[PDB]
C-alpha cells in the first residue's frame, strides 16, 4: 500500500482501517504526507499492530500522529513480530511525546529484527536520548538511525560520543540530523568515530545556519576522504566559502544549503 | 643528508634580501649576526634540496631520500614572494614537507592563504610575523584566520603595526593555539591586554615599548592568570 499526499475527509480513516483488518498479506504499509487529519489515526494504529499479520515495512511519515496513537503502538509492540523498520519520522508530538517514547524504549525486547529505526520528535526527547542507548547497543544490525527535527547540544554530542565509544555494530551505514546547535568543540567533540565506521555511506548533519571553523573544514575533508563510500553526503546550512569548497574533496555530491 | 655540520659561516648573504628583515624583528637587541647567518645558510640548504627534488623527476619514487633531508629543518617564506615550485613541493611531497620543525612566514595575498590553507597536513609549529600593517582589513583578518588555523601550535610576532590597536583581541580570538606572543612598539588597548592576560595557553610573552602606563584591567595589575607562563 502506497498512499502519498492524498487528502482525507477526517472520517475515512476509520473505514480505511476497517478494510485493512481483512488484509493479512500486507507486507508494506506506506502512508505519508498527510493533511491535518488528527483523530482517526489512533484508530488506524488500534487496528494495526493487532490481529497478527505479515506487515514488515511500516512507513507512516509526516502525518501529525498523536502521542496517544504512539502509546497504542507501544502497547502493541508485542504483536506483528517481524516488523523491522518502525519509522514515525517527520512527526512532532506537541506533548507527552517523551513519555510515549520512554515506553517504546523500555519495550521492543521481543523484536530482534529491528533495523533502520527512525525516531519521533517530541518536547523534549533530548532528555531520553541516553535511554535509547540502553537497547541501541544491543542491536548489531542498526544500519541507520534517524534523529530529526530537534536541537542538539554539546552535552548530547558527548553522550553520543559515548555511544560511539563504541561497542561496534559493524553494519552502520547511514545517519541523519535535521538541525542542531553545534559549535567547534562538538562537532570536534565527537570525532574519532569515523575510523570505526569506515563503511559510512552518507549523513546530513544539517544546521539552521553555521559558519564552519577552519579546523572543521580541514578535519572534515580529510576524515570524509578516507571513508569507504561517502556517497551523496549532505551538509545543509553550512556557510562554506569558495576556498573551503575547494579544500573539500571530490565527493560524489555535496549539498551545503 | 649525511652531512650535518655547517662549516664556514662567512658571506652567503645573497639569499633573503631582507637580511636584517628590512627594519623589522630581530633588531638591535639580541642580534647575534652569527646565528642569523646560520639561519640564512640553512634556509638556502633547504631550498637547494627542494630544487633537487623538483629536478629529480622522482616525485614519489624517492620520498624517503627527500624526507630525511628536510627532517629537523626550517623553511622561510616571504609572503611578497612565493615561487611556483613551493606548491609542488608541499602538495606533491606529503609526509616530508611536514617533517620540517618550523616554517617562518613574514609579511596579505590569497596566494599565501592558498598555500597554507591546504589539505596536505596541519604543520607542527608556525612562526608568523607581521610588519607592514598600518591597517587591518576584515579580509586580512579572515585570511589570517585560515593561516593561523592550519597549525598544531602557533608563534606570533607583531611589530610596529598601527592597525592592530583595538584589533589584537579580535585577531587573537581567531585561534587559541598561540603559545608564544610578542609585540614590538605597537600600541594596544586595554581590551587587547585583557585578551592576552585572559588566555592561559601562553608560555612566552614579551612586551616592548607599551606606554599606556594605566593597565588596571591587565598585566600590570595581575598577570597571575597565566599559570603556564614560563618566559
Distance of alpha carbon B146 from alpha carbon A243, whole angstroms: 10
Looking at the complex, does the CB of residue B74 fall below 8 Å from at least one CB of chain A? no
Question: Grid coordinates 523498520 are at which residue?
Answer: A85
Give the Cα separation of B38 and B4 in Å (integer): 13
Q: Where in chain B does DSSP place strands (E)?
A: 74-78, 102-106, 123-130, 151-159, 178-184, 204-208
Give dist(CA B224, CA B209) in Å, integer: 21
Q: How far apart are the C-alpha atoms of A179 and A102, rounded to whole Å?
A: 22
CA-based nearest distance B111→chain A, Å: 11
- Shortest distance between the Cα of A251 and any Cα of chain B, in A, equals 15
Which grid coordinates are listed for B68?
A: 630525511
Q: Are B186 and B165 in contact (CB under 8 A)?
A: yes
User: If you ran DSSP here, which 8-state letter would residue B127 be given?
Assistant: E
Contact between B149 and A218 using a beta-carbon 8 Å cutoff: yes
Distances in Å between the alpha carbon of B2 and those of A197, B85, B184?
A: 43, 25, 39
The b/e string for A130-141 (b: 16+ C-beta within 10 A; e otherwise) is: ebbeebbeebee
For residue A225, list chain B residues with Cβ-Cβ distance below 8 A.
119
Q: Which residues pair with B208 in a beta bridge?
A: B184
Q: Which residues of A touch B (CB under 8 A)?
A: 213-215, 218, 221-222, 225, 243, 247, 249
Nearest to A83 by CA among A127, A134, A45, A37: A45
* Quoted resolution (Å): 4.5
Tally of CB atoms within 10 A around A239: 12
Write the residue in B114, B119, B145 that is nearest to A214 by C-beta: B145
Residues A219/A190, Cβ–Cβ less than 8 Å: no
Does B119 contact A213 at a Cβ distance shorter than 8 Å? no
CB within 8 A of B55, min separation 6: which ones? Answer: none
CA distance A59 to chain B (A): 42
Q: Using a CB–CB cutoff of 8 Å, tell me whether B113 touches chain A.
A: yes
Please count the other Cβ atoms lying within 10 Å of the Cβ belonging to residue B152: 11
Please tell me what DSSP assigns to residue A132. Answer: H
- Measured between alpha carbons, how far is A99 from A107 in angstroms, rounded to an integer? 13
Does B166 contact A at CB distance below 8 Å?
no
Helix axes A97-105, A129-136, angle to 10 degrees: 20
Determine, for residues B149 and A221 on separate chains, whether the beta-carbon distance falls below 8 Å. Answer: no
Segment (H or E) for A254: strand A254-255
Chain A positions touching B145 (Cβ under 8 A) are 214
Cell numbers for B71: 627532517
Amino acid at each position: 500500500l502506497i498512499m502519498d499526499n492524498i487528502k482525507m475527509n477526517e472520517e475515512d480513516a476509520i473505514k480505511l482501517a476497517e478494510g485493512l483488518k481483512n488484509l493479512k498479506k500486507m507486507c508494506l504499509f506506506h502512508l505519508t504526507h498527510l493533511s491535518d487529519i488528527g483523530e482517526g489515526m489512533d484508530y488506524i494504529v488500534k487496528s494495526l499492530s493487532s490481529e497478527p499479520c505479515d506487515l514488515e515495512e511500516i512507513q507512516l511519515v509526516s502525518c501529525c500522529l498523536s502521542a496517544n496513537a504512539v502509546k497504542i503502538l507501544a502497547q502493541n509492540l508485542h504483536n506483528l513480530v517481524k516488523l523491522s523498520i518502525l519509522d514515525l519520522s517527520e512527526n512532532y508530538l506537541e506533548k507527552d511525546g517523551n513519555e510515549a517514547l520512554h515506553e517504546l524504549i523500555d519495550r521492543m525486547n521481543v523484536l530482534e529484527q529491528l533495523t533502520a529505526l527512525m525516531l519521533p520528535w517530541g518536547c523534549d526527547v533530548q532528555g531520553s536520548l541516553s535511554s535509547l542507548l540502553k537497547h541501541l547497543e544491543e542491536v548489531p544490525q542498526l544500519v541507520k538511525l534517524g534523529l530529526k527535527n530537534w536541537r542538539l547540544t554539546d552535552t548530547e554530542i558527548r553522550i553520543l560520543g559515548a555511544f560511539f565509544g563504541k561497542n561496534p555494530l559493524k553494519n552502520f551505514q547511514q545517519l541523519n540530523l535535521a538541525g542542531n546547535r553545534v559549535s567547534s568543540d562538538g562537532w570536534l567533540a565527537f570525532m574519532g568515530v569515523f575510523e570505526n565506521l569506515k563503511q559510512l555511506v552518507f549523513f546530513d548533519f544539517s544546521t539552521k545556519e553555521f559558519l564552519p571553523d577552519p579546523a572543521l573544514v580541514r578535519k572534515l575533508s580529510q576524515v570524509l576522504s578516507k571513508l569507504t563510500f561517502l556517497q551523496e553526503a549532505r551538509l545543509v546550512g553550512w556557510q562554506f566559502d569558495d576556498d573551503d569548497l575547494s579544500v573539500i574533496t571530490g565527493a560524489f555530491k555535496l549539498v551545503t544549503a | 643528508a649525511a652531512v650535518y655540520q655547517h662549516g664556514c659561516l662567512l658571506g652567503l648573504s645573497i639569499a633573503k634580501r631582507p637580511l636584517w628583515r628590512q627594519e623589522s624583528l630581530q633588531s638591535v637587541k639580541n642580534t647575534t649576526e652569527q646565528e642569523i647567518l646560520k639561519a640564512i645558510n640553512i634556509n638556502s640548504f633547504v631550498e637547494c634540496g627542494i630544487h633537487l627534488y623538483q629536478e629529480s623527476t622522482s616525485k614519489s619514487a624517492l620520498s624517503q631520500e627527500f624526507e630525511a633531508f628536510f627532517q629537523g629543518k626550517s623553511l622561510y617564506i616571504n609572503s611578497g614572494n612565493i615561487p611556483d615550485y613551493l606548491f609542488d613541493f608541499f602538495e606533491h611531497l606529503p609526509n616530508c614537507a611536514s617533517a620540517l620543525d618550523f616554517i617562518k612566514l613574514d609579511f596579505i595575498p590569497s596566494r599565501a592563504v592558498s598555500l597554507f590553507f591546504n589539505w596536505k597536513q596541519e604543520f607542527r609549529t608556525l612562526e608568523v610575523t607581521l610588519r607592514d600593517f598600518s591597517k587591518l582589513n576584515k579580509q586580512d583578518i579572515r585570511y589570517l584566520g585560515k593561516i593561523f588555523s592550519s597549525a598544531t601550535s602557533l608563534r606570533l610576532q607583531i611589530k610596529r603595526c598601527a592597525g592592530v590597536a583595538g584589533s589584537l583581541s579580535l585577531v587573537l580570538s581567531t585561534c587559541k593555539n598561540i603559545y608564544s606572543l610578542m609585540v614590538e612598539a605597537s600600541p594596544l588597548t586595554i581590551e587587547d591586554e585583557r585578551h592576552i592576560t585572559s588566555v592561559t595557553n601562553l608560555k612566552t610573552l614579551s612586551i616592548h615599548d607599551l606606554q599606556n602606563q594605566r593597565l588596571p584591567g591587565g598585566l600590570t595589575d595581575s598577570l597571575g592568570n597565566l599559570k603556564n607562563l614560563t618566559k
